[PDB]
Amino acid sequence: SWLLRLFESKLFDISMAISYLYNSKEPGVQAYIGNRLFCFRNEDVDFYLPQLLNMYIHMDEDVGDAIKPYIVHRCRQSINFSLQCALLLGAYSSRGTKLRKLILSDERLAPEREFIKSLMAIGKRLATLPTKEQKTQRLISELSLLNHKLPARVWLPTAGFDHHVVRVPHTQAVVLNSKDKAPYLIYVEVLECENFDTTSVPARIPENVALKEPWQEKVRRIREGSPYGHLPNWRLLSVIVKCGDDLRQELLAFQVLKQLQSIWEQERVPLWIKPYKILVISADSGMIEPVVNAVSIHQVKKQSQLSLLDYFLQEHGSYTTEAFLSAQRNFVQSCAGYCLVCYLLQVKDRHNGNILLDAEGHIIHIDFGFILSSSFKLTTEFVDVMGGLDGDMFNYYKMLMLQGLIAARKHMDKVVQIVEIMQQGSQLPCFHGSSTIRNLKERFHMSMTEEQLQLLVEQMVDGSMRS
Amino acid sequence: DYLFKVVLIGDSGVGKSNLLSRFTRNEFNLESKSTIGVEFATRSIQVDGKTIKAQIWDTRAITSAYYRGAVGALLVYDIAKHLTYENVERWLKELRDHADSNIVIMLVGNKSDLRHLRAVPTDEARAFAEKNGLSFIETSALDSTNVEAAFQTILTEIYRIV
Numbered sequence A: 001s002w003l004l005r006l007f008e009s010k011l012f013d014i015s016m017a018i019s020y021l022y023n024s025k026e027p028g029v030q031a032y033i034g035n036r037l038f039c040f041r042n043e044d045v046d047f048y049l050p051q052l053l054n055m056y057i058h059m060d061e062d063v064g065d066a067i068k069p070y071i072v073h074r075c076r077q078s079i080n081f082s083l084q085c086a087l088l089l090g091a092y093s094s095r096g097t098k099l100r101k102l103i104l105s106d107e108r109l110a111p112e113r114e115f116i117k118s119l120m121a122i123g124k125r126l127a128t129l130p131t132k133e134q135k136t137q138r139l140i141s142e143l144s145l146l147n148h149k150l151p152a153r154v155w156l157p158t159a160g161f162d163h164h165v166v167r168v169p170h171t172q173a174v175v176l177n178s179k180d181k182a183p184y185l186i187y188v189e190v191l192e193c194e195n196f197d198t199t200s201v202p203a204r205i206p207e208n209v210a211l212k213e214p215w216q217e218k219v220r221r222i223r224e225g226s227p228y229g230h231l232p233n234w235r236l237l238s239v240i241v242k243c244g245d246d247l248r249q250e251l252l253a254f255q256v257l258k259q260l261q262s263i264w265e266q267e268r269v270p271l272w273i274k275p276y277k278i279l280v281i282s283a284d285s286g287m288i289e290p291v292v293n294a295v296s297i298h299q300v301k302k303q304s305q306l307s308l309l310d311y312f313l314q315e316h317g318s319y320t321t322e323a324f325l326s327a328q329r330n331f332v333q334s335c336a337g338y339c340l341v342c343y344l345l346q347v348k349d350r351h352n353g354n355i356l357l358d359a360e361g362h363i364i365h366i367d368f369g370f371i372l373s374s375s376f377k378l379t380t381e382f383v384d385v386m387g388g389l390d391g392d393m394f395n396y397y398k399m400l401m402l403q404g405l406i407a408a409r410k411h412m413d414k415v416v417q418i419v420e421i422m423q424q425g426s427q428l429p430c431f432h433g434s435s436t437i438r439n440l441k442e443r444f445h446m447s448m449t450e451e452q453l454q455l456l457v458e459q460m461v462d463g464s465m466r467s
Numbered sequence B: 001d002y003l004f005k006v007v008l009i010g011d012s013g014v015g016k017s018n019l020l021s022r023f024t025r026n027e028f029n030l031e032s033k034s035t036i037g038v039e040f041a042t043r044s045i046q047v048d049g050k051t052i053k054a055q056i057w058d059t060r061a062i063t064s065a066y067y068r069g070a071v072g073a074l075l076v077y078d079i080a081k082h083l084t085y086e087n088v089e090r091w092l093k094e095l096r097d098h099a100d101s102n103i104v105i106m107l108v109g110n111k112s113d114l115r116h117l118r119a120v121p122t123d124e125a126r127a128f129a130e131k132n133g134l135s136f137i138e139t140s141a142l143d144s145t146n147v148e149a150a151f152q153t154i155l156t157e158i159y160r161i162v
Ligand SMILES: COc1ccc(-c2c(C)nc3c(NCCNC(C)=O)cc(Cl)nn23)cc1S(=O)(=O)N1CCC(CO)CC1
Pocket: A176, A177, A183, A184, A213, A214, A215, A218, A238, A240, A242, A276, A288, A289, A290, A291, A292, A293, A294, A295, A296, A353, A354, A355, A366, A367
């Protein structure tokens, strides 16, 4: 009864459920929890979908059979849910196949699956164009052909809500680098739904310049030009398309960032970070929901020809202005946040090509390749913005890191769970070691005293400055 | 225009952090996560026709550096906990060792709403208050009767450097 006691208490959440499901060898508990999944809010359980599906594949049939009923139910009440399952099911198997074929089958998704295939197809073709600008022009043309098929039964799973895609402002699309299988950013027009699953696809509305501009300014320009723009139903979305890059590690980092965000949210630590949504489509390819009002450090330095501090003063005002001190504050909090993330996940390959700066002054790390077992920099440019090593704002940066560390420890188990389950039957480079998760736990330093942690924060920072 | 750095000091529990959230975010909370080291918060006001911005720092291990460059310090005790008032003597010997010898200080009795639990009489405090060179007031972050007054007083008092 001691087990059942816990499970019937308020303490029981989807987190606890998954932990026992993953670890417990008792078939009576597994089945009991399988049923208990239904009582939880769809949104809360949704977050753990990658974990659940992983268990299904790599764990005992008993465990799968406990998971299956809930999954099928959701798939049956939401094609969005169905889609994400099928995509994840496929990606994480290269046991899976039986359910994947069965889920996509009736128990019509062709429009969506063909829609997605074309986007991938486009990207692969751009490989023959060795320059950024050439790719962009080829993209725009080929995107226009998409428009010929615009009003159709498809949606963007990366969207917070259900909807229909109406229009692609192809002229606005841009390619983000010169690489062989370069990713590309596109803007998409949609009409919001109350529910996709019960609603007729909208009717076509007949077609009658791209420059560097803020997001809200970009919506205006696009809206005024758009056929559907008059409608109140109309909204503009955006996604990045990666045709040849694995996003499974990227997804894992996302969950961790979201958890760490919640941890720091539950506690009262004013660290700042920005998780960006991830969509695994294959082990090859995925999509990303981009941050608006932000651009790379590298390009910030190429148009301004300035140093980071100089750019802040130009773009916000002198250190005596409110806008600057606010921006500085947003900078410092975002630096401490991402430092901790980099350390905990052991993120490498850190350079100014991989750090974005938003319009409020936050920095944002993006490339979570090279983490954990697979084998962060505090440059003086960064230290200058903080007012220098003797600066109060810099001292605060160190203060936040400690605070955010103490917070993380209080919820350590929530974090490791996400990673430890994912390691299952895994061939991801981040799991190459024998002790990937074990080393991860050591990095929380649960044994350390706070005085010891103060010292550890200092040690971390000294390392971060050498470059 | 100006930039005034102010610190909040006192025994743990006296109410510094809620004072800060009331005055700067007009927010209060009964549930409390302990402050690890230091916080600031900022809000701008006008005194005698001039736009000022106040930077308040809410403070075991003690980096004496944060005391540096503070024009004003609010020294707070809990009216309902005599010991917190008792340690006000030890909190003033510290501040003269590690802080500007010509700094504006306000003594603050917080939680004045707890009338029936009062352990420190207003007269005894203000007596000690004007017996020394500190300005004095009692606040309730909970009811927020004297919180605005306190800052604007000390900030006005401060600007009085010329
Ligand atoms: C997987 O790596 C990421 C990660 C994040 C983003 C991203 C998000 C979520 N949001 C934005 C973003 N926001 C600006 C949106 N503009 C608007 C809406 O006006 C601008 C930019 Cl460059 N990246 N980005 C893009 C890519 S990437 O694969 O495309 N590639 C990787 C290689 C280089 C890394 O350094 C350049 C970026």
